[PDB]
Amino acid sequence: LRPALSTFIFLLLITGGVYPLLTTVLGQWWFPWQANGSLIREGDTVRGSALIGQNFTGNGYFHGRPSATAEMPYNPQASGGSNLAVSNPELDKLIAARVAALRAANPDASASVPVELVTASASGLDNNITPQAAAWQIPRVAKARNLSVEQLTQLIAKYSQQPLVKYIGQPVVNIVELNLALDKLD
Amino acid sequence: MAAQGFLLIATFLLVLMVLARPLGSGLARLINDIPLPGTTGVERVLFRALGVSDREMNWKQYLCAILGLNMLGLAVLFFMLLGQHYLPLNPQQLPGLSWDLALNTAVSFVTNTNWRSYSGETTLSYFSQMAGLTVQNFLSAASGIAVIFALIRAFTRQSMSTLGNAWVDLLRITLWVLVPVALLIALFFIQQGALQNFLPYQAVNTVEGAQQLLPMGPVASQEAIKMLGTNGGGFFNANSSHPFENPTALTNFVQMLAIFLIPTALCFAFGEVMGDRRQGRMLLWAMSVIFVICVGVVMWAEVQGNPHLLALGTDSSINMEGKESRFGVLVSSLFAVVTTAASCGAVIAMHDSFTALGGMVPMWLMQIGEVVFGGVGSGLYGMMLFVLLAVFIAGLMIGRTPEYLGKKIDVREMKLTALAILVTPTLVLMGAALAMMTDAGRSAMLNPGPHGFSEVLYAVSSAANNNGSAFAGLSANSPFWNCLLAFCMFVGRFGVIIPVMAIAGSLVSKKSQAASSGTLPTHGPLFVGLLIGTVLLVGALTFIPALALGPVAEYLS
Amino acid sequence: MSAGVITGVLLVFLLLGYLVYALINAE
Amino acid sequence: FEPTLVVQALKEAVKKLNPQAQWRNPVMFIVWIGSLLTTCISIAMASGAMPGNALFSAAISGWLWITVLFANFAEALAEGRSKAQANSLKGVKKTAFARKLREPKYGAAADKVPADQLRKGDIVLVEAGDIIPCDGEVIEGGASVDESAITGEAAPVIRESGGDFASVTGGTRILSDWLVIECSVNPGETFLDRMIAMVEGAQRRKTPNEIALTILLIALTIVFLLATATLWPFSAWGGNAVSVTVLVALLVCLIPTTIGGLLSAIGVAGMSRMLGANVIATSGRAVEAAGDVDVLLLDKTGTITLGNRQASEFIPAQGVDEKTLADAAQLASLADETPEGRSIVILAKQRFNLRERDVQSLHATFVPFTAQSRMSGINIDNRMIRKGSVDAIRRHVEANGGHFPTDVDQKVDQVARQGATPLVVVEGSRVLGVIALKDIVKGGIKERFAQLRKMGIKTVMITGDNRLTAAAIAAEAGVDDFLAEATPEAKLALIRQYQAEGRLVAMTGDGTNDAPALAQADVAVAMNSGTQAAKEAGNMVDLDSNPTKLIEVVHIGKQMLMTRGSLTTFSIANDVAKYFAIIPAAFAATYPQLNALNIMCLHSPDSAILSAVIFNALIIVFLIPLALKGVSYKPLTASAMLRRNLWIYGLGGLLVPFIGIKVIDLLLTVCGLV
Ligand SMILES: CCCCCCCC/C=C/CCCCCCCC(=O)OC[C@H](COP(=O)(O)OCCN)OC(=O)CCCCCCCCCCCCCCC
Ligand SMILES: [K+]
Structure with missing residues (x-):
């Protein structure tokens, strides 16, 4: 019984106590930005990490993927997905509502809205959309922000993030940094 | 597409095998009860200090050691989750999980299941995560590997009646196999973008008038161990899709490799131990x-x-x-x-x-x-x-x-x-x-x-x-x-x-x-x-x- | 729950008892 | 499978259909209790309080009763055939009459009685011509017997009164003498009667392998009982619940009823079939040990000797001509009426067409084969021509005032190098030459040993010669390990050596000299020519006195195991197709969406389940012939035999149920019952 109890207390220390303490002190030794949440500071307010995205609803701001979080969209205290299955007709009704809203807000872009903007996200805090979807918006944003198309596409290029190998993920726009760069670009 | 799905599978398996053969020999050395190359002085002083020794165990005693360790893990974990409003590292004062959810989470994490009905970011403080869930992640995975070590030694031994002792196998699996490789995968995630800190939930005034409350915590440590030990109980609710647990496609790939690192390494070690x-x-x-x-x-x-x-x-x-x-x-x-x-x-x-x-x-x-x-x-x-x-x-x-x-x-x-x-x-x-x-x-x-x-x-x-x-x-x-x-x-x-x-x-x-x-x-x-x-x-x-x-x-x- | 369902549950449990009993013996 | 035995096993099945007699087959017991449950549901529907459609649940319960009746019938048929074989063996003994003496002294009026009624106190006479009807003790007189039934080599043996020959057996054939015996109720002298009584009763020891297989079938039955029983909650949530009758049908069909029912029939079929091969098993354990033997100590004599050695080379003592050498060797061997001398003369005529010798050379004095002289010959000339062994010829030439030339001995050493026992011929007092007589293998045995080598059964020779000739004969036969100067204790040592590795050992040894080895051996086919002390060692008892029979006992062992495994796979697989016949036709009213799985295009839900159950019962009765005549098999290498039985019965168990269920459904629709 002394082996069992001492082995357990010792693995409690080495894992629970020490191992988090070591990973946490190396984390703040080497990567003080990616480790502390990857915050995007400005002045003194913390305008949302560059990883958890936000709820964008203006008309001069790119739109991430719909949320389905617990309270107000993109609320990183529940970060649930949207477990509505395919059979559930409520998913088809929600997609119909979103497609109608999207189509009626972007009247110059395609009539067929990409699937990323129509659906939810596994996290609900998904910050990103494949550069196709971000490119789809461009008509509306160009109009709202009085920015020509060429520079807006340049701007999506600057804040997109191709993965390492071409098939481990898929190209990715970074909506938070993107919209912030827009506001700066004003 | 699928022309570029089959590449993904090919690269995933190929890399998993390259990473698994080495570690497979690692676990072969552990199964045979030979000091992992560098640790014999440390193994000796540590085992002598603890009380574990060279004496081996028959199947009854091995089983009872592993079940005693797991059941003791269950007792301490159930009591941590049932009193986390008396333990430190409460960034947001959070109440003690109810009896039913406490029991479910405890029994889940002790038995390597890591089923999760709670919401990690609003229901668990850090201390429970850091020294509750992760510790039982380590010990549930070490129990699983100690049992497959008992089985493989059973196949490769002849006329003996002892399956090597369970405390030594748990200590070597945890300290040597899991803690290093998990500390390394955890430093990798803390680069890619995962977070590893103990700050209180940080406020956020979004670029619009709205506002949100980012969670924080020791997430990268618990990620490295929740994958490598095939657990699943990540920190947040949408465990391995939250951008704070698995930030970019590359950590997703490291997590798939880690999910198969030890099962495949065990298959290669099993291949080795038998000589064939x-x-x-x-x-x-x-x-x-x-x-x-x-x-x-x-x-x-x-x-x-x-x-x-x-x-x-x-x-x-x-x-x-x-x-x-x-x-x-x-x-x-x-x-x-x-x-x-x-x-x-x-x-x-x-x-x-x-x-x-x-x-x-x-x-x-x-x-x-x-x-x-x-x-x-x-x-x-x-x-x-x-x-x-x-x-x-x-x-x-x-x-x-x-x-x-x-x-x-x-x-x-x-x-x-x-x-x-x-x-x-x-x-x-x-x-x-x-x-x-x-x-x-x-x-x-x-x-x-x-x-x-x-x-x-x-x-x-x-x-x-x-x-x-x-x-x-x-x-x-x-x-x-x-x-x-x-x-x-x-x-x-x-x-x-x-x-x-x-x-x-x-x-x-x-x-x-x-x-x-x-x-x-x-x-x-x-x-x-x-x-x-x-x-x-x-x-x-x-x-x-x-x-x-x-x-x-x-x-x- | 109901007459039929309780008899059914009880009978399936009885047959599983007998089967596991046979699986734990040489008969 | 003839009518008489069929009807008798059918009545036996009906009488074995009661529940108190099938505790002991939990797969058939689940089919039985299911059948009872659905007949109760059927009665309730037919007149009482249930949803309706009394027929379809009565037809499902009728066909499930038929399934139980067919399982009981297959087992009853196997046992019936076994009883027939046993009674036929005992009927070899029942072909004899019995002459009972009124006065115990020899010479009196005796009446003929069938050879089964002789009991304690009787005094019976057995004279030349009859068969010994029953056991007993010799009290007066002396006869020579042939032990023909209890001895398959026909060698005679003298049986005299007032001596160690007072133990008399039953069934054998007597010779041209006479014997007065007293029938007794002491333990018999046959191992036939013992097993005959063993299997004829209502008992049978499950063998380890058939317990493992039952553990597999019971796990399958639990898994499917839980699945098909938990279909009721799921269904009942999704709509109108699944009936109980369709669920008992799905449960019975899935359960491995084919191998479930046939298991016992296979065991007793293997025993009966071996009994047909004339060897008396003792228990299924011994048959499956036969199935596992990795080495069989076949002694050289019996099978690898093919009688006695015959001449191979001509070696002259005096540089003589091979023609005159063979002529003088045959002339001298004409007086050797043993098989060896006849073979020497035959090989002489064959080698050089030296065929006949007229009467003019005759009018001689023939020297028969004698133990004292150890030499045979002919005194045609004034000199004596002789033929014998090397030692006896050297001792007789030294005794006959002659001498052996050194070249003769040097050539004898050459024959010793050849590995052949040398025979010598001497004319008068000067040696004529030596002839090399190498012993032949049976001729058609290297191939069977090769096949065994493929299966994984390393043959092993055991000979009394030296470790050169024994190796020669080994390579000549196609064996693996050979022993020289085989001494029984050394045989036992080798047996324990091969057992220590885990390998089972097979053996054939008569006579008490091999008794301890036999008992130590794992599959000991005690030949039925040896002493009762050797037969009682046991684990097998032969009757044809052919030591090669062990090979057939191994074929029967692996046939029985192959049948078990093969039908197991056939049943598990069989379930894949029964799912496509039952699932989409059980839920075709709860979930209409599931008609797309009805790939067989079965007619109607009701017909689909009635047809799946019918095919279940007809498979158990179609596979009887196979479960009784064993799974035919050629000895391919282990991996290739796995590949043949997986192809044949894996696709048996996928492609045969499709054809089965669809044909039964097709028939039902045509006849117009659905
Ligand atoms: C529903 C099932 C139905 C399943 C029925 C299909 C299986 C029948 C397989 C037939 C193959 C014919 C090829 C014959 C021609 C090809 C010749 C060749 O080149 O080799 C061929 C390599 C040999 O490799 P080897 O042996 O090491 O070589 C010689 C060294 N000694 O076999 C192969 O294809 C192996 C591939 C086949 C895998 C089969 C496994 C399926 C078994 C499923 C059954 C379930 C069991 C019940 C469980 C409760
Ligand atoms: K798990």
């Missing part, structure tokens, strides 16, 4: 063929996806309903088959919203027994129960008496094998029956009809197989689901571990005759065939009734 590597290769070929065909089916179902999206007005029928966007459907599909095949249980795309067929295959790979590359250690010994079954059938249709690696297989192994194989189908089916009869059980769905029943079957199926994945619509927080799933997980894990150890105890008292010229090779395309056949046939025969009312009926809907 071809046994290890045999096992990997069986498990790989099942996994690859499975990922083919899933990737295909997803890329077909929801046709309503194409009718409703969308641009492509791809099923990006649950899935994340940093990952496509190819990578999320591969991660659903990887997470549920290996009993990892870390969802990366809410498994509910997969197209009916796309969700049958992971659900099925759970119900099969978590055989294909199963959880840390659980994979190999569950696979070996199916291998004893296949060896028995083959020996029975060759005239020989059953044999595997030279050791005969008499009735005392057959009873134990039949019971261990039984333990998980009986739990999942009896549980699905109990849930679908009691009113509380079937008032915790989100989708109606066929898929509605599929959620219950998949929840019970994950829990009793120790998977931890979940269809995530099923509100599993009501005391009924907590107790039901708690009992399911408990009896799943330990009900399998007790017969496995009885098998090892009864296989260490034999003597392995040489390989005559008339013993069917257990290595080669025909025996890997008959192993795949045994696994798929038993799984399909058992579960096609249950699956004909769940996914399939939805697919044909």
Whole structure:
């Protein structure tokens, strides 16, 4: 019984106590930005990490993927997905509502809205959309922000993030940094 | 597409094998009870200080050591979760988990399941995460590997009666195998973007007037260990899709490699220990063929996806309903088959919203027994129960008496094998029956009809197989689901571990005759065939009734 | 739950008891 | 499978259909209790309180009763055939009459009685011509017997009164003498009667392998009982619940009823078939040990000797001509009426067409084969021509005032190098030459040993010669390990050596000299020419006195095991197709969506389940012939035999049920019952 109890207390220390303490002190030794949440500071307010995205609803701001979080969209205290299955007709009704809203807000872009903007996200805090979807918006944003198309596409290029190998993920726009760069670009 | 899914699979397996052969030799050295190359002074001083010693254990004492350690882990974990409002590292003063949720989370994390009805970011303080869940992640995975070490030593020993001592195997597996490799994967995630800090929940004034409250915590440590030890209990609610647990596609790839790092390394170490590597290769070929065909089916179902999206007005029928966007459907599909095949249980795309067929295959790979590359250690010994079954059938249709690696297989192994194989189908089916009869059980769905029943079957199926994945619509927080799933997980894990150890105890008292010229090779395309056949046939025969009312009926809907 | 369902549950449990009993013996 | 035995096993099945007699087959017991449950449901429907459609549940319960009746019938048929074989063996003994003496002294009026009624106190006479009817003790007189039934080599043996020959057996054939015996009730002198009584009763020891297989079938039955029973909650949630009758049908169909029912029939069929091969088993354990033997100590004599050695080379003592050498060797061997001398003369004529010798050379004095002289010959000339062994010829030439030339001995050493026992011929008092007589293998045995080598059974020779000739004959026959100067204790040592490795050992040894080895051996076919002390060692008892029979006992062992395994796979697989016949036609009213799995295009749900159950019963009665005549098998290498039985019965168990269920459904629709 002394082996069992001492082995357990010792693995409690080495894992629970020490191992988090070591990973946490190396984390703040080497990567003080990616480790502390990857915050995007400005002045003194913390305008949302560059990883958890936000709820964008203006008309001069790119739109991430719909949320389905617990309270107000993109609320990183529940970060649930949207477990509505395919059979559930409520998913088809929600997609119909979103497609109608999207189509009626972007009247110059395609009539067929990409699937990323129509659906939810596994996290609900998904910050990103494949550069196709971000490119789809461009008509509306160009109009709202009085920015020509060429520079807006340049701007999506600057804040997109191709993965390492071409098939481990898929190209990715970074909506938070993107919209912030827009506001700066004003 | 799928031209560039098959690359993903090829690179994933190739890299998994490259990373697994080395560590496979590592675990071969541990199984043989030879000091891992550098640690003999440290091992000696530490064991002498603790009280563990050289004395070995017979199957009863090994089993009782591992179960004493796990049950003690369960006691301390249940009490941490049940009093976390008395422990430090409370950034937001959080209440003590209720009795039912405490019991469910405790029994889940002790038994390597890491089922999660709570919401990690609003229900658990750090101290519980840091020194509760993660510690039991380490010890549940170390228990799994200590049991498969007992089994493999049982196969490679002759006429002994001792399976080496359990405290030494737990200490060497944790300290040497898991803590370093997990500290390394955790520094990798803390670079890629995961977070590893103890700050209070940081305020955020979004670029619009709105405001949100980012969570924080020790997430990268618990990620490295929740993958490497095939656990699944990530920090936040959408565990391995939250951008704070798995930030970019590259950490997603490191997490798939880590999900299979130890099960595959164990197969190679098993191949080594017996002296005939071809046994290890045999096992990997069986498990790989099942996994690859499975990922083919899933990737295909997803890329077909929801046709309503194409009718409703969308641009492509791809099923990006649950899935994340940093990952496509190819990578999320591969991660659903990887997470549920290996009993990892870390969802990366809410498994509910997969197209009916796309969700049958992971659900099925759970119900099969978590055989294909199963959880840390659980994979190999569950696979070996199916291998004893296949060896028995083959020996029975060759005239020989059953044999595997030279050791005969008499009735005392057959009873134990039949019971261990039984333990998980009986739990999942009896549980699905109990849930679908009691009113509380079937008032915790989100989708109606066929898929509605599929959620219950998949929840019970994950829990009793120790998977931890979940269809995530099923509100599993009501005391009924907590107790039901708690009992399911408990009896799943330990009900399998007790017969496995009885098998090892009864296989260490034999003597392995040489390989005559008339013993069917257990290595080669025909025996890997008959192993795949045994696994798929038993799984399909058992579960096609249950699956004909769940996914399939939805697919044909 | 109901007459029929209780008799059914009881009979299936009885047959599983007998079967496991046979699986734990040489008969 | 003839009518008489069929009807008798059918009545036996009906009488074995009661429940108290099938505790002991939990797969058939689940089919039985299911059948009872659905007949109760059927009665309730037919007149009482249930949903309706009394027929379909009465037809399902009728066909499930038929399934139980066919399982009981297959077992009853196997046992009936076994009883027939046993009674036929005993009927070899029942072909004899019995002459009972009124006065115990020899010479009196005796009446003929069938050879089964002789009991304690009787005094019976057995004279030349009859068969010994029963056992007993010799009290007066002396006869020579042939032990023909209890001895398959026909060698005679003298049986005199007042001595160690007072133990008399039953069934054998007597010779041209006479014997007065007293019938007794002491333990017999036959191992036939013992097993005959053993199997004829109502008992049978499950063998280890058939317990492992039952553990497999019971696990399958639990898994499917839980699945098909938990279909009721799931269904009942999704719509209108699945009936109980369709669920008992699905449960019975899935359960491995084919191998479930046939298991016992296979065991007793293997025993009966071996009994047909004339060897009297003792228990299924011994048959499956036969199935596992990795080495069989076949002694050289019996099978690898093919009688006695025959001449191979001509070696001259005086540089003589091979023609005159063979002529003088045959002339001298004409007086050797043993098989060896006849073979020497035959090989002489064959080698050089030296065929006949007229009467003019005759009018001689023939020297018969004698133990004292150890030499045979002919005194045609004034000199004596002789033929014998090397030692006896050297001793007789040294005794006959002659001498052996050194070249003769040098050539004898050459023959010793050849590995052949040398025979010598001497004319008068000067040696004529030596002839090399190498012993032949049976001729058609290297192939059978090769086949065994493929299966994984390393043959092993055991000879009394030296470790050169023994190796010669080994390579000549196609054996693996050979022993020289085989001494029984050394045989036992080798047996324990091969057992220590885990390998089972097979053996054939008569005579008490091999008794301890036999008892130590795992499959000991005690030949039925040896002492009762050797037969009682046991584990097998032959009757043809052919030591090669052990090979057939191994074929029967692996046939029995192959049958078990093969039908097991056939049953498990069989379930895959029964799911496509039952699932989409059980839920074709709850979930309409599931008609797409009805791939066989079965007619109607009701017809689909009635047809799946019918095919279940007809498979158990179609596979009897196979479960009684064993699974034919050629000895391919282990992996290739796995590949043949997986192809044949894996696709048996997928492609045969499709054809089965669809044809039964097709028939039902045509006749117009659905
Ligand atoms: C529903 C089932 C139905 C299953 C029925 C299909 C199986 C029949 C297989 C037939 C193959 C014919 C090929 C014959 C021609 C090809 C010749 C060649 O080149 O080799 C061929 C390599 C040999 O490799 P080897 O042996 O090591 O070589 C010689 C060294 N000694 O066999 C192969 O194809 C192996 C691939 C086959 C895998 C079969 C496993 C399926 C068994 C499933 C049954 C379930 C069991 C019940 C469980 C309760
Ligand atoms: K898990």
